[PDB]
RNA sequence: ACUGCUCUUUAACAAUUUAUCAGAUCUGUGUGGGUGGCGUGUGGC
DNA sequence: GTTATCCGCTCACAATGCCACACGCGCTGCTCGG
DNA sequence: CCGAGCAGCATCATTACTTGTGAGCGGATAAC
């Protein structure tokens, strides 16, 4: 069989991805509409968001939904939350760079229950449900087999919206570059997390992430054999936007490596 | 894993129910029951006692030894704990490793 | 004016009914109805017409326990412990049990009103799960339940007819797994 | 039925006869043990009890005994011996009169 | 008997912004592939 | 009274290796099931 | 109706002479 909420979510994600892909071939219609410090929100984001919300309301007119745009639309049954990013890495889309994904996760009683991310360009569908695992178009996902820092590929995002910590981040970057093999910088935390679940990157870390972006990936990597944490092993990440994740041994090595360079602001 | 605690059958529908499977059945049964109670309005004393019973069951699974006995049915003898599969002259150490 | 509180005693795996019987019998034995108000074993009647179990099914609020309106005293205590098959007094320290709170009684009785009022078939359905159809018109087809209804009870279910998916109003009686 | 069949079928004492030799069979019927329910077990048997006690003479054989872990705990009844009306071991003697 | 008198010759468009001269593979059926765990007891050395 | 001292009691923890052979290893009124 | 499966059970007192040893703990016993 299959998990029901997962199924309705993947239907929503399919529709949204098809809409985004269809609009991707007319860059004269989607404009750059900035919201904060280089966080564009184009009209296509609004359209995809509305499509997803409509598709959901058919099957759950009572579930409270969360969205970076519409804040928090309450529902008559607010024990279960629907966190959405209709588009991740808006910048990668405006530059028409074909690497982005829509992310839909459903939390139950606070604990994340199901998650999906969908890249329409490569047509890849990372699904994950707790107690059953993670799948990539039908293949199980056990993350990277790395157990050190050598030969390891580290995906990351830069605090290009919280540039005050830049130095700090860059500091640690240098430290990391003394032990790892190579970096990756794609521009969509959801897809980076997904890659962590697929072992295509030996780990990942980031500073300054909104609570509505990792919610679709943290469960992905969790049911993908990997683990997440704050920059110190705690769990305040859900509030600090500071994530470090990967297969367990690599996470341990990274934490022991980063704990010193860390500026005590994030602690 | 399912392999290391196999359920080998017999000439008929008779299966050698290894103690591990039975202890796991007991503990998972307690867990399911307790969760179903937790969602169902949770009478306080009842959930308290059920938590105690579940603690006893997981205890027995990790070790049938302490705090009392959890002997099997139809055979007045204890069930093989996980620790049992390690200690003694029968545990993996003095039986298959060394 | 001795107010008999509400206590709970652990029954056994499959003994609860006859335990309650024997309890009332021993009450009558010692004629201590004044000390033993009522022995409560709440239950539930989930009703499905087919699918193996048919036309009814009997669940319980929670097994292994029995609820009594006893009054606290050592005499009553042994009167409940001098019965065929029970464990000790579920509660605080033994020989000094803990009566359950009145709020517990009120909530449990609201539960009983709710359950006995509406015969509610559990093993319910969730919008979004896939399921086949064992019915003549759509034998062994399979679609996804897009909406679950209880009173009408007619399973708004999207299934593939003439290419385009479409809702269907088939009743519970023909659903497959889940 | 369960109790009696469990005793006669699966008990530490019950065992299918050592039936390969008439002498083996006989000496296995009149066999005395100290193990089993109510009895001590060979691990904690104690080095003492296994010894022969001068009251054994004529009552229980001092020779026939399985060499191994259970020595003395598995004895064989003497030939002329007999069980008492209580469960003690009586031995026949000849009543010596004056001379 | 006792609410009920023409309104006037059939569906009524979405498509849209450099730009161009259009810009070899269609195979197999060679083949590995079609009762034990534990406990107890006995005896032996 | 304090403060530590030591002691009686309790509880955990060990029991040769092999072999060989033999024997045996849910149940029971709930659940289901037609 | 009645056979076949099944779900969680101290099934009261189910007791139980040592085995020998070590460690720890609650409580008697004595110094300041
Ligand atoms: Mg977003």
UniProtKB/Swiss-Prot annotation, chain A:
It catalyses: a myo-inositol phosphate + H2O = myo-inositol + phosphate; 1D-myo-inositol 1-phosphate + H2O = myo-inositol + phosphate; 1D-myo-inositol 3-phosphate + H2O = myo-inositol + phosphate. Pfam families: Inositol_P. It is found in: Cytoplasm. Its cofactor is Mg(2+). One of its GO terms (biological process) is transcription antitermination. CDD domains: IMPase. One of its GO terms (molecular function) is magnesium ion binding. Substrate binds at residues 68, 87-90, 184, 213. Induction: Transcription is autoregulated. Repressed by the Nus factor complex (NusA, NusB, NusE (rpsJ), NusG and SuhB). Optimum pH is 7.8. Changing residue 174 to V: No growth at 30 degrees Celsius, IMPase activity not inhibited by RNA polymerase (RNAP). Monomer. A monomer-dimer equilibrium. Homodimer. The rRNA transcription and antitermination complex (rrnTAC) consists of RNA polymerase (RNAP), NusA, NusB, NusE (rpsJ), NusG, SubB, ribosomal protein S4, DNA and precursor rRNA; S4 is more flexible than other subunits. Binds to RNAP, which decreases IMPase activity against 1D-myo-inositol 1-phosphate. Association with rRNA gene-transcribing RNAP is dependent on NusB. Interacts with AR2 domain of NusA; crystallizes as a 2:1 SuhB:NusA heterotrimer. Belongs to the inositol monophosphatase superfamily. E.coli makes very low amounts of myo-inositol-containing phospholipids, so the catalytic necessity for this enzyme is low. This is Nus factor SuhB. It comes from Escherichia coli (strain K12). The gene is suhB.
Curated annotation (Swiss-Prot), chain D:
It comes from the Bacteria. Transmembrane segments: none annotated. DNA-dependent RNA polymerase catalyzes the transcription of DNA into RNA using the four ribonucleoside triphosphates as substrates. Belongs to the RNA polymerase beta chain family. The RNAP catalytic core consists of 2 alpha, 1 beta, 1 beta' and 1 omega subunit. When a sigma factor is associated with the core the holoenzyme is formed, which can initiate transcription. This is DNA-directed RNA polymerase subunit beta. The gene is rpoB. The chain holds residues 499 to 597 of 1342 of the full protein.
């Amino acid at each position: 069989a299959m998990h029901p909420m997962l199924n309705i979510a993947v239907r929503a994600a399919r529709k949204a991805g098809n809409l985004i892909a269809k609009n991707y071939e007319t860059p004269d219609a989607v404009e750059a509409s900035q919201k904060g410090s280089n966080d564009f929100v184009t009209n296509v984001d609004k359209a995809a968001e509305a499509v997803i919300i409509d598709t959901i309301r058919k099957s759950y007119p009572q579930h409270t939904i969360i969205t970076e745009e519409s804040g928090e639309l309450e529902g008559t049954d607010q024990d279960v939350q629907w966190v959405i990013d209709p588009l991740d890495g808006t910048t990668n889309f405006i530059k028409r760079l074909p690497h982005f994904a829509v992310s839909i996760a459903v939390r139950i009683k606070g604990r994340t229950e199901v998650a999906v991310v969908y890249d329409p360009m490569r047509n890849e569908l990372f699904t994950a449900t707790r107690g059953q695992g993670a799948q990539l178009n039908g293949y199980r996902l056990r993350g990277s087999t790395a157990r050190d820092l050598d030969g390891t590929i580290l995906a990351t995002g830069f605090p290009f919206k919280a540039k005050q910590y830049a130095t700090t981040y860059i500091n640690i970057v240098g430290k990391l570059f003394n032990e790892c093999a190579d970096f990756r910088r794609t521009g969509s935390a959801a897809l980076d997390l997904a890659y962590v679940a697929a072992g295509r990157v030996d780990g990942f870390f980031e500073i300054g992430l909104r609570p509505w972006d990792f919610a679709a990936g943290e469960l992905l990597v969790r049911e993908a054999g990997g683990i997440v944490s704050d920059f110190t092993g705690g769990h305040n990440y859900m509030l600090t936007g500071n994530i470090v994740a990967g297969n367990p041994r690599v996470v341990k090595a990274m934490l022991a490596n980063m704990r010193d360079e860390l500026s005590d602001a994030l602690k | 894993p399912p392999d290391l605690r196999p359920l080998v059958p017999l000439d008929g529908g008779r299966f050698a129910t290894s103690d591990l499977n039975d202890l796991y059945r007991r503990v998972i049964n307690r867990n399911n029951r307790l969760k179903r109670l937790l969602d169902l309005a949770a009478p306080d004393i009842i959930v308290r006692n059920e938590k105690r019973m579940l603690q006893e069951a997981v205890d027995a699974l990790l070790d049938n030894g302490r705090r009392g006995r959890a002997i099997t049915g139809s055979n007045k003898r204890p069930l093989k704990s996980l620790a049992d599969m390690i200690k003694g002259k029968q545990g993996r150490f003095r039986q298959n490793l060394l | 004016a001795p107010k008999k509180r509400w206590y709970v005693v652990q029954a056994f795996s499959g003994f609860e009914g006859r335990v309650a019987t024997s309890l009332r019998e021993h009450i009558k034995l010692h004629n201590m109805e004044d000390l033993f108000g009522e022995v409560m074993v709440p239950t539930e009647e989930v009703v499905e017409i087919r699918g193996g179990q048919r036309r009814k099914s009997e669940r319980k609020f929670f097994p292994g326990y029995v609820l009594v309106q006893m009054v606290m005293n050592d005499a009553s205590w042994h009167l409940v412990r001098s019965v065929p098959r029970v464990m000790g007094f579920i509660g605080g320290t033994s020989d000094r049990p803990a009566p359950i709170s009145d709020k517990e009684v009120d909530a449990i009785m609201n539960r009983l009103q709710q359950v006995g009022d509406k015969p509610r078939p559990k093993t319910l359905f969730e919008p979004g799960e896939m399921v086949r159809v064992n019915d003549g018109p759509f034998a062994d087809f399979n679609g996804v339940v897009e909406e679950v209804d209880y009173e009408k009870s007619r399973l708004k279910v999207s299934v593939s007819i003439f290419g385009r998916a479409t809702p269907v109003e088939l009743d519970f009686s023909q659903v497959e797994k889940a | 039925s369960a109790a009696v069949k469990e005793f006669f079928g699966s008990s530490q004492l019950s065992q299918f006869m050592d039936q390969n030799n008439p002498l083996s069979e006989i000496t296995h019927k009149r066999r005395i043990s100290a193990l089993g329910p109510g009895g001590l077990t060979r691990e904690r048997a104690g080095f003492e009890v296994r010894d022969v006690h001068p009251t054994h003479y004529g009552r229980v054989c001092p020779i026939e005994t399985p060499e191994g872990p259970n020595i003395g705990l598995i004895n064989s009844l003497s030939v002329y011996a007999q069980t008492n009306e209580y469960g003690f071991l009586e031995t026949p003697y000849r009543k010596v009169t004056d001379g």
